[PDB]
Amino acid sequence: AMVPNVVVTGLTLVCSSAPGPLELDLTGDLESFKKQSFVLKEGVEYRIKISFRVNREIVSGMKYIQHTYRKGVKIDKTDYMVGSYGPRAEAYAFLTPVEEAPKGMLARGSYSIKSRFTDDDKTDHLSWEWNLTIKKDW
């Protein structure tokens, strides 16, 4: 079937005070990102926005799962209800709740995030890895 039912097209950290965009294009080469970092200044709020298409049928029980790492070890597994989506033309977008970038030098450092977007079939609609560095400043 030429193109798959669920195509994850992008990840964006939506953050009002970041000086520049913070987008990953997930339709391209995913191997580019382990060389790139997103920087968040400590303490700022952000959301994560995942953009995806549903091309030809109901997806139920979508979930966005996040395993976060510091220094090679797993410090957090979080997952979010995405829900149910029917096929259409325009990409959909899913926004996590508002979170706060950690503050304090128990917080600052480099984090690596393994993301999956799945549903109830445990379909790998996509998995990708990216980096997040938390800093005293931009």
Curated annotation (Swiss-Prot):
Lineage top rank: taxon: Eukaryota
Outcome of mutating residue 35 to A: Loss of interaction with NGFR
Alphabetic keyword roster: Acetylation, Cytoplasm, Disease variant, GTPase activation, Isopeptide bond, Phosphoprotein, Ubl conjugation
GO CC annotation, single: cytosol
Position(s), cross-link Glycyl lysine isopeptide (Lys-Gly) (interchain with G-Cter in SUMO1): 74, 77
Modified residues (N6-succinyllysine): 77
Modified residues (N6-acetyllysine): 41, 63, 77, 114
GO MF annotations in UniProt: GTPase activator activity; Rho GDP-dissociation inhibitor activity
Covalent cross-link Glycyl lysine isopeptide (Lys-Gly) (interchain with G-Cter in SUMO2) as placed by the record, residue numbers: 74, 77
Subcellular location: Cytoplasm
Main location: cytoplasm
A biological-process GO annotation: regulation of Rho protein signal transduction
Disease: Nephrotic syndrome 8: A form of nephrotic syndrome, a renal disease clinically characterized by progressive renal failure, severe proteinuria, hypoalbuminemia, hyperlipidemia and edema. Kidney biopsies show diffuse mesangial sclerosis, with small glomeruli, hypercellularity, increased extracellular matrix, and contracted/collapsed glomerular tufts surrounded by immature or abnormal podocytes.
Functional description taken from the UniProt entry: Controls Rho proteins homeostasis. Regulates the GDP/GTP exchange reaction of the Rho proteins by inhibiting the dissociation of GDP from them, and the subsequent binding of GTP to them. Retains Rho proteins such as CDC42, RAC1 and RHOA in an inactive cytosolic pool, regulating their stability and protecting them from degradation. Actively involved in the recycling and distribution of activated Rho GTPases in the cell, mediates extraction from membranes of both inactive and activated molecules due its exceptionally high affinity for prenylated forms.
Subunit structure: Monomer. Interacts with FER. Interacts with PLXNB3. Forms a heterodimer with RAC1. Interacts with RHOA, the affinity is increased by three orders of magnitude when RHOA is prenylated. Interacts with PSMD10; the interaction increases ARHGDIA association with RHOA, leading to ARHGDIA-mediated inactivation of RHOA and ROCK and prolonged AKT activation. Interacts with KANK2; the interaction is direct and may regulate the interaction of ARHGDIA with RHOA, RAC1 and CDC42. Interacts with RHOC. Interacts with CDC42. Interacts with NGFR (via death domain); NGFR binding decreases the affinity for RHOA.
Family to which the UniProt record says this protein belongs: Belongs to the Rho GDI family.
Protein name, UniProt field: Rho GDP-dissociation inhibitor 1
Gene that encodes it: ARHGDIA
Residues of the full protein shown: 67 to 202 of 204
